[PDB]
Amino acid sequence: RLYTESAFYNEMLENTVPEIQRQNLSHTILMLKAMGINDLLKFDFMDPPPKNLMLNALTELYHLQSLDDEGKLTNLGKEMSLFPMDPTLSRSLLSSVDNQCSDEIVTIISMLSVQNVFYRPKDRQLEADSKKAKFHHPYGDHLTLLNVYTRWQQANYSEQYCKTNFLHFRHLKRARDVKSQISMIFKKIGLKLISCHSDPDLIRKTFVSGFFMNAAKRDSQVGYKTINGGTEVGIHPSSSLYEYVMYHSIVLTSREYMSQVTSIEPQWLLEVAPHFYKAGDAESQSRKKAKIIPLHNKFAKD
Amino acid sequence: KLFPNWIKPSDSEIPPLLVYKWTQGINNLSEIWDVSRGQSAVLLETTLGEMAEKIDFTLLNRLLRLI
Amino acid sequence: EITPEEATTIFSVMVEWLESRSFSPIPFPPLTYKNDTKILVLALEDLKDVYASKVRLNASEREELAL
Amino acid sequence: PIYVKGGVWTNVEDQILKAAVQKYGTHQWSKVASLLQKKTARQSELRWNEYLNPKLNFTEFSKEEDAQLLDLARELPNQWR
Amino acid sequence: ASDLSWSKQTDTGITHFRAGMTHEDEKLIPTIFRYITTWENEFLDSQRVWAEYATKRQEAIQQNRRL
RNA sequence: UAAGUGAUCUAGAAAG
Numbered sequence: 335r336l337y338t339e340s341a342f343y344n345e346m347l348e349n350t351v352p353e354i355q356r357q358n359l360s361h362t363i364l365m366l367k368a369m370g371i372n373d374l375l376k377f378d379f380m381d382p383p384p385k386n387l388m389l390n391a392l393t394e395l396y397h398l399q400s401l402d403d404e405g406k407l408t409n410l411g412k413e414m415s416l417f418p419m420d421p422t423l424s425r426s427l428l429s430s431v432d433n434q435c436s437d438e439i440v441t442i443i444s445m446l447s448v449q450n451v452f453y454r455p456k457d458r459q460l461e462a463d464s465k466k467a468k469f470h471h472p473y474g475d476h477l478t479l480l481n482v483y484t485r486w487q488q489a490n491y492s493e494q495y496c497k498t499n500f501l502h503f504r505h506l507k508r509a510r511d512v513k514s515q516i517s518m519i520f521k522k523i524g525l526k527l528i529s530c531h532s533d534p535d536l537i538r539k540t541f542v543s544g545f546f547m548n549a550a551k552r553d554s555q556v557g558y559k560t561i562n563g564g565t566e567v568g569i570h571p572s573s574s575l576y577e578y579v580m581y582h583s584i585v586l587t588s589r590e591y592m593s594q595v596t597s598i599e600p601q602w603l604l605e606v607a608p609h610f611y612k613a614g615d616a617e618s619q620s621r622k623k624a625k626i627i628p629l630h631n632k633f634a635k636d
Numbered sequence: 637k638l639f640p641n642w643i644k645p646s647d648s649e650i651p652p653l654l655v656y657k658w659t660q661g662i663n664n665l666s667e668i669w670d671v672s673r674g675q676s677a678v679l680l681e682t683t684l685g686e687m688a689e690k691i692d693f694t695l696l697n698r699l700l701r702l703i
Numbered sequence: 704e705i706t707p708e709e710a711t712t713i714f715s716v717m718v719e720w721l722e723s724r725s726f727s728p729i730p731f732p733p734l735t736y737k738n739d740t741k742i743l744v745l746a747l748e749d750l751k752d753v754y755a756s757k758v759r760l761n762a763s764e765r766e767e768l769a770l
Numbered sequence: 771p772i773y774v775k776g777g778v779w780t781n782v783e784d785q786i787l788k789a790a791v792q793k794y795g796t797h798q799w800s801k802v803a804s805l806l807q808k809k810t811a812r813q814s815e816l817r818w819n820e821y822l823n824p825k826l827n828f829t830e831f832s833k834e835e836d837a838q839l840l841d842l843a844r845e846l847p848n849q850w851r
Numbered sequence: 852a853s854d855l856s857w858s859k860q861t862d863t864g865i866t867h868f869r870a871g872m873t874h875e876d877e878k879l880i881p882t883i884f885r886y887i888t889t890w891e892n893e894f895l896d897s898q899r900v901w902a903e904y905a906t907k908r909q910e911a912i913q914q915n916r917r918l
Numbered sequence: 919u920a921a922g923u924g925a926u927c928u929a930g931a932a933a934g
Contacts, residue, residue, distance in 0.1 A: 632734070695710050702717055762775060873927085
């Protein structure tokens with residue numbers, strides 16, 4: 335042990351920690367509400383989470399419309415609780431028939447339920463990046479996920495095709511099995527499964543519909559600024575964009591990044607989530623609040 | 637695209653650069669140097685004297701109200 | 704100095720020109736712009752360019768700087 | 771405290787300026803400015819020209835005068851000087 | 852300093868060099884003109900380097916990298 | 919039938 339006996343006996347914590355103190359509680363609150371727990375603060379956990387984590391997750395569920403402002407389940411929150419899913423993904427997926435691209439969204443969701451399928455060896459970056467560019471949709475990492483899965487299921491597939499295109503077969507195989515299991519639930523609950531002849535706007539609108547709080551805007555000083563909390567963030571290296579994006583993931587290292595990014599028209603953000611993109615909710619008038627004000631005025635009303 | 641290419645000073649090119657470009661243009665005209673078939677070139681430099689110094693505001697105003 | 708006929712002719716010409724261009728006019732600038740701030744920053748910079756060199760400044764100059 | 775000049779014309783200040791003008795005349799605007807601790811030379815001169823000079827007038831315009839005005843507007847577009 | 856009376860009529864090849872800014876104990880002070888890239892060179896050069904840039908930009912696009 | 923001859927201004931004192 336590369337530390338003292340005293341450090342072992344006195345300075346190391348006994349246990350990590352239980353999983354409850356290391357989570358977001360968005361799924362946990364929706365489960366507790368569906369179980370009939372009104373008072374979440376006084377739920378008898380063996381180790382209670384920080385109260386702020388519970389409060390933030392109640393606020394997110396109210397924005398998603400799963401709870402009301404008095405903290406009770408809506409029809410949407412009751413239907414959401416029937417799915418064994420994150421809420422943003424489940425909500426994007428349920429609504430996807432209304433936007434005529436349920437088949438594509440069922441693919442995108444299954445791909446987002448597995449790890450990054452693109453292999454990039456440290457000494458073989460250029461060949462790996464070139465193979466990824468076969469499937470890459472510019473300004474559309476979520477569409478890139480649709481394209482790889484569609485190729486992976488193509489008749490033109492061969493035994494070692496995943497190795498020769500720098501793709502992780504285990505993750506794509508898992509995404510297939512997830513897609514089939516998801517599709518069986520769509521059939522069981524009457525969702526309607528549908529698609530469009532040709533439309534990336536609908537896929538983007540569906541993705542916005544779940545992930546409208548995980549949005550960021552291009553800005554001169556910060557690179558990108560998040561809609562929630564006003565965080566300075568870069569695009570994570572894995573993506574180079576050709577002014578608004580939705581992100582799947584916030585990556586914290588020595589700098590803040592956002593990873594797995596798809597461009598979105600910000601009119602669609604106002605249309606799909608008008609309660610959240612209410613300009614009153616934005617403090618003062620920083621870059622985001624300022625850019626939302628022209629979009630409402632100069633690019634929408636007139 | 638208000639101001640057409642032909643207006644010089646504002647082009648984002650340096651006055652010597654501008655001059656050079658002009659020269660190039662002159663050269664690159666199709667069969668410009670021929671003197672065979674009575675071909676005759678003329679270059680006309682002139683200054684628009686008091687171009688700003690007699691702009692009437694009335695007319696100017698109306699003109700601007702176009703743009 | 705301008706004969707009204709001349710003015711009319713001029714107007715006709717300019718109108719004809721923009722007609723040929725499909726030149727949409729410049730609006731009165733609202734609160735819409737993403738560039739607004741950027742635009743402002745240019746003008747200020749330009750103005751500052753006068754004042755960065757000369758350290759001793761007049762009253763008017765001082766006022767301008769303050770602004 | 772030293773500072774950049776401007777502000778608003780208090781009546782006393784205006785009176786002082788008038789007095790100065792009587793004294794030093796309409797082309798020594800520096801001196802008059804100096805006499806006013808708040809207001810500049812340029813400011814002062816402008817004020818004199820615009821508001822304070824008695825050979826101006828602020829009486830209302832007759833109907834004929836109104837006509838003349840609006841006609842001028844129609845004909846000279848916003849060249850208000 | 853070529854033949855002033857002839858030079859007025861036609862351009863001469865420079866024949867006679869006058870001494871400009873002279874001095875006793877003449878250490879050959881270099882001019883400034885030699886240390887500034889003469890415009891034509893600058894412009895041909897510009898054309899080259901910008902062409903190169905263009906080509907590499909295309910390469911970057913093809914390769915999908917930041918140049 | 920294939921090199922280098924030569925033209926070389928100034929110039930410091932007072933008071934402001």
